[PDB]
Design a binder for this molecule. Structure first.
Ligand code: Y9P
Length: 119
């Protein structure tokens, strides 16, 4: 589709970045986002950094947005998907963190579709 191709190929503009910030702030404000605001503490999660190859959290994404790290929407989506995929990979499906990942990714997908349509 056009949205698929734009996501992979169209460089993010200044206006795009304002939308990225709105999406990120919406995720940070969500009731289920608190496990993802800051990096996992090793005292909360034995072996976490040895198991998870590419850790990610919303504070790292915020820094990257502020530094204009992302050139394509795909890269932003990839970092966000790391947050949820890492959580579900490390934790069993009955973990409360796994449940938060399910809810918050669903919210992200809704917001992401709105952002793609706006471009
Ligand atoms: C296993 N495990 N442990 C903690 C955590 N979040 C922390 C809680 C408060 N700050 C970050 C996640 Cl996401 C996780 O998967």
């Amino acid at each position: 589709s056009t949205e698929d191709a734009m996501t992979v190929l169209t460089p993010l503009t200044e206006k795009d970045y304002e939308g990225l910030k709105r999406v990120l702030r919406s995720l940070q404000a969500h009731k289920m986002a608190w496990p993802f605001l800051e990096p996992v503490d090793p005292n909360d999660a034995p072996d976490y950094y040895g198991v998870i190859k590419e850790p990610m959290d919303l504070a790292t994404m915020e820094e990257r947005v502020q530094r204009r790290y992302y050139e394509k929407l795909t890269e932003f989506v990839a970092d966000m998907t790391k947050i949820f995929d890492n959580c579900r990979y490390y934790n069993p499906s009955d973990s409360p963190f796994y449940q938060c990942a399910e809810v918050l990714e669903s919210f992200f997908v809704q917001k992401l579709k709105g952002f793609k349509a706006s471009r």
